[PDB]
Design a protein around this ligand. Sequence first.
Ligand SMILES: *[C@@H]1O[C@H](CO)[C@@H](O[C@@H]2O[C@H](CO)[C@@H](O)[C@H](O)[C@H]2NC(C)=O)[C@H](O)[C@H]1NC(C)=O
Lengths: 49, 36
Amino acid sequence: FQPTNGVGYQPYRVVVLSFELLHAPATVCGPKKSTNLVKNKCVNFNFNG
Amino acid sequence: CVNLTTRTQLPPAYTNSFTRGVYYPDKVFRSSVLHS
Ligand SMILES: *[C@@H]1O[C@H](CO)[C@@H](O[C@@H]2O[C@H](CO)[C@@H](O)[C@H](O)[C@H]2NC(C)=O)[C@H](O)[C@H]1NC(C)=O
């Protein structure tokens, strides 16, 4: 790790984020603008995703 | 943990396992279905 190495030799920070669920309970979510529950009328649901 | 020294050999026996050992293969609820 020479201080003046070429960019092809300089430290990167390659980190991998892996994620693939099938039916496990959710524990991570994004912006999450989750609203209130609605009733027997036809509604577009997002629930768990 | 001390070395126990009162074992009596008696080589183990075998038992015919019956219809046991089935868990819930997946996490999805079902009803009145036969799933392979
Ligand atoms: C009796 O206890 C010793 C204590 O570890 C077990 O380990 C044996 O003796 C020394 C440990 O200082 C090792 O160098 C030997 O290789 C160990 N022997 C074996 C067969 O692993 C020892 O195993 C115990 N005796 C038993 C369980 O019969």
